[PDB]
Amino acid sequence: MVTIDSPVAGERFEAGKDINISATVKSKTPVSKVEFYNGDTLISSDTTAPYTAKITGAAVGAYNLKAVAVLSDGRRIESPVTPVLVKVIVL
């Protein structure tokens, strides 16, 4: 399986802060890279566990975070989507 461990679904953040994203991959097949998305846009990828990306200086809005493990055989494994919201100020 592939899981986003941070942030958690529904978390709120403040504008201009980095959103640090962490993902865990459990597989028998070697992982070539974990690709990190916001909606359909590729943020970055990581070839080395623990797998992470960051949205640096996050602008305001709704972000739908997903991780996709690409195994060495080509097979893609999706995480569920982790939606977060970035606001001007979080009370």
Query: 7, 21, 38, 46: which one contacts Na ion (CB under 5 A)?
Result: 46
Query: 28, 41, 48, 59: which one contacts Na ion (CB under 5 A)?
Result: 48
Question: Is 50 annotated in some ligand binding site?
Answer: yes
Question: Is 46 annotated in some ligand binding site?
Answer: yes
Question: Is 90 annotated in some ligand binding site?
Answer: yes
CB atoms within 10 A of CB 3: 13
Residue number, 25 or 86, with CB nearest to Na ion? 25
List b or e across 44-74, with b for residues whose CB sees 16 or more CB atoms inside 10 angstroms.
Answer: ebbeeeebbbebeebeeeebebbbbbbbeee
The reply on whether position 35 binds Na ion by CB under 5 A is no
Beta bridge mates, 36: 44, 67
- Contact residues for Na ion (CB under 5 A)? 46, 48
